[PDB]
Structure formats: C-alpha cells, structure tokens
Design a protein around this ligand. Structure first.
Ligand SMILES: Nc1ncnc2c1ncn2[C@@H]1O[C@H](CSCC[C@H](N)C(=O)O)[C@@H](O)[C@H]1O
Ligand SMILES: [Ca+2]
Length: 213
C-alpha cells in the first residue's frame, strides 16, 4: 500500500465523481493535512491555470504525471477536441494517474504515454502529432534542457509554442534557464511561487581509492 494509493483512495471517497475541481481540492486537502506529496499544488496550479487560459493550447505535452494532479489541472481547462499527452516512466504512477483521470471524467481528453521522455519524444511524430502548443516540464530536472533541445530537434516546436517549466529555482534548473534565457529562440518570463515544503530523494556516494592505473 503506497502513498499514491492512499491519495487515490482519498479522492475516490471525498471528491465528487466526474468533477475535476473537486478532485484537485481533495488531493490538495490530503497533501496539506495528511501526507505531503510532490504535486504542483494549488498555489502553482493557479499560475498554470492562467498560462493555459492565456495561451489557449489545443495540444499539450506534460513531462511527469505522478498521480495526475497537474494533468487534471490542465485538462479541465481545455476546450472540446483538445488533447493532453502526458509522459510517465513509472508504470505504477501511470496506473494511479489513469485512475485519477477516470474518476474525474477526463480520460477522453488525456492520453498517458508510459516511458521516459527522452525515448518517447522522438516517437511523437507517429501519434498524429505535428507540433505542440504547450509543454509542461515537471519530470527529472536533469532532463529539462536535453528534452527541450530534443523537442526542437524532432521538429515538435512551432513559433509560439509555450514551454512552462516547474522547479527552476528549487531544486533549481540553472542550465535550462541559461539556455532559454540566453537563446534568441525563446522569450522568457519568470513566475515566483512560495514553497512551504518539499522533499526530494538525494544521496551520498562513498568512493574508496584503490590506487592508480
Ligand atoms: N524521463 C522521464 N520521463 C517521464 N517521466 C519521468 C521522467 N523522469 C522522471 N519522471 C517522472 O516525473 C514525475 C515527477 S513528479 C510530477 C508531478 C506532476 N507534474 C504534478 O504536479 O502533479 C515522477 O512521477 C517521475 O516518475
Ligand atoms: Ca514539481
């Protein structure tokens, strides 16, 4: 029994079925009052709402679904006929996200792609996909810059495509920022958001020297 399962089960018994707003409130409730989890959360969600509303995407690509909070957040704002693709490499997370979408009634607007972004991005041109309107980057931070470059190399960006990148300060994505900011191919805006708490996996490496080669 995983935390992600506990989040899903809470949603299923407290949110209104078929009601995306209700689902987001249930997750945000659970994760502020019971068990913190790595969703963008409501504060950042409101920035995301405005970006979607300002830029009016018909085709959205999300990198990193987890339990589907951000996927519900964006897909509930999309017009009929619009599509959200979300790449998730963890099959168990993909399964939770599908349940979350099904409960919220968004399964028709969203397609989960199980796999790593770096492998799936070059396959997109075989999903009836020409170019993307908006990309939400919220997966492994080491991938922001290469996936962005990959997206460009695969011809998936059009003039006006919006990249929205989370966590560019904490833990931080300095390489990505210097690239898009320094590049004449990208017009960049920054949006501050206060972050009450976050936990990430880290580690130490111990390397014992055994002598030279
Ligand atoms: N290369 C990659 N391709 C697809 N998913 C990846 C990935 N690297 C990490 N991930 C996934 O990215 C997720 C980051 S957490 C994503 C949270 C989500 N955007 C929300 O706010 O609700 C994790 O679920 C992890 O499994
Ligand atoms: Ca994040």
């Amino acid at each position: 029994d995983t935390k992600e399962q506990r989040i899903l089960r809470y949603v299923q018994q407290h949110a209104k079925p078929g009601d995306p707003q209700s689902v987001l409130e249930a997750i945000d409730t659970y994760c502020t009052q019971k068990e913190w989890a790595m969703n963008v959360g409501d504060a950042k969600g409101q920035i995301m709402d405005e970006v979607i509303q300002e830029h009016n995407p018909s085709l959205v690509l999300e990198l990193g679904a987890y339990c589907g909070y951000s996927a519900v957040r964006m897909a509930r704002l999309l017009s009929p006929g619009a599509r959200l693709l979300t790449m998730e490499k963890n099959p168990d997370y993909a399964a939770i996200t599908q349940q979350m979408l099904n409960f919220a009634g968004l399964q028709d607007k969203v397609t989960i792609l199980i796999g790593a972004s770096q492998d799936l991005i070059p396959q997109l041109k075989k999903y009836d996909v020409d170019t993307l309107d908006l990309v939400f980057l919220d997966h492994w931070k080491d991938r922001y810059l290469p996936d962005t470059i990959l997206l460009e190399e695969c011809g998936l960006l059009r003039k006006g495509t919006v990249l929205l990148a989370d966590n560019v300060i904490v833990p931080g994505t300095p390489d990505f920022l210097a690239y898009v900011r320094g590049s004449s191919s990208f017009e960049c805006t920054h949006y501050s958001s206060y972050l009450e708490y976050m936990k990430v996996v880290d580690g130490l490496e111990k390397a014992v020297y055994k002598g030279p080669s």
